[PDB]
Amino acid sequence: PTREPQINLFKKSNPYKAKVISNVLLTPETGTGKRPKKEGEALVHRIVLAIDHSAYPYVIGQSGGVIPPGEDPEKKAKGLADVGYTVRLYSIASPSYSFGMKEDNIEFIIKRDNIYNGNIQFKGVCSNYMCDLKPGDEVTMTGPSGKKFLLPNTDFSGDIMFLATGTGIAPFIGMSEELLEHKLIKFTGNITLVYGAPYSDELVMMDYLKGLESKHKNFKLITAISREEKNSFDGGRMYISHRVREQAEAVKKILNGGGRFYICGGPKGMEKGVIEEIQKISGNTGTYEEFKHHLEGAHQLFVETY
Ligand SMILES: Cc1cc2nc3c(=O)[nH]c(=O)nc-3n(C[C@H](O)[C@H](O)[C@H](O)COP(=O)(O)OP(=O)(O)OC[C@H]3O[C@@H](n4cnc5c(N)ncnc54)[C@H](O)[C@@H]3O)c2cc1C
Ligand SMILES: NC(=O)c1ccc[n+]([C@@H]2O[C@@H](COP(=O)([O-])OP(=O)(O)OC[C@H]3O[C@@H](n4cnc5c(N)ncnc54)[C@H](OP(=O)(O)O)[C@@H]3O)[C@@H](O)[C@H]2O)c1
Ligand SMILES: [Zn+2]
């Protein structure tokens, strides 16, 4: 709520407690759906926490931090006296003032981060804790965290391209609702959301997103289903990067029209492929990093990958 980002209003020494309102699964229960045994599981939950927007005035594009209950084995073994699990960050998926501007909650899009044969081998601590939350449970929170990945704070006319993979879709749900419905600013540009995942059933919030597309014209939705589609260029898996190449003109519109690029999701450093595809389109032949830093400097690039 209330524009202008604040960070670290809550640290591990003064956490913020939040009660769980809802925690619903968004992907097929294990065994159902397209992902075969040998490829493990893709269990993605949508999690809604009740908070006091007065005490936790977050801004969409920011991250919330969670502290999983318990003692970190590695820390105890190293004997740290801290021992408590270190914070895990998650992209806030709800719009600044919540859906319907009720200012009553905050939401996350979290996936069980396991390893896996097809059977489980290692089990992510925090992601599973979250996905195991029951309505009424209390969550230890930190933040807000981050103040770079943000929307314009004044009226905007340039086009905006959202590039997401998997859970990276989170920030773009809130941002999409805020730009198209909440209108905290007069936005007159075109939104292009390029969203990628392994299987069609692992694309989450689709009903909502497709609905956004049919209601606006202001908003186009493209998907890259990597394990069901091959790109037309090299016949490899279809990634969002290949979609960018197909959207050469929407890309050019942004490069020359003062638009913005938001890239979010995994795996770590997945922005490289997307960025150097944008560079091909611009035709600029500087080094990858010279082009990337230029865009960021020009406020036309925003990247959060993990
Ligand atoms: C800015 C930011 C935003 C993020 N947003 C989201 C988001 O919106 N949604 C989301 O789901 N995640 C998001 N993440 C990731 C999140 O922060 C966590 O890193 C992630 O959920 C996994 O945390 P974990 O505690 O469950 O995994 P950890 O317990 O820290 O384990 C990490 C990985 O290591 C593996 N592992 C554990 N033990 C071993 C071992 N002995 N040998 C080999 N491997 C092992 C685990 O299986 C796991 O896959 C974000 C991260 C960042 C930095
Ligand atoms: N277990 C792994 O080592 C592994 C495997 C794939 C990606 N990531 C996954 O990404 C995180 C989230 O998983 P999720 O179930 O929410 O969905 P997801 O596995 O993250 O899928 C996101 C999409 O990005 C694609 N991709 C992989 N490398 C890329 C690059 N360099 N440039 C552009 N796109 C790329 C993936 O294609 P693919 O069909 O080739 O994966 C996938 O379709 C992690 O949990 C991790 O599982 C790492
Ligand atoms: Zn509308």
Author numbering: 7 to 122, 125 to 314
Please quote the paper that reports this structure:
Ferredoxin-NADP(H) reductases (FNRs) are flavoenzymes that catalyze electron transfer between NADP(H) and the iron-sulfur protein ferredoxin (Fd) or flavin mononucleotide-containing flavodoxin. Leptospira interrogans FNR (LepFNR) displays low sequence identity with plant (34% with Zea mays) and bacterial (31% with Escherichia coli) FNRs. Crystal structures of LepFNR reveal a typical plastidic type reductase, analogous in its folding architecture to the enzymes found in plant and cyanobacteria, in spite of displaying an important divergence at primary structure level. Overall topology of the LepFNR molecule has the canonical FNR fold, which consists of two well defined domains, although several unique structural features were found in LepFNR 3D structure.
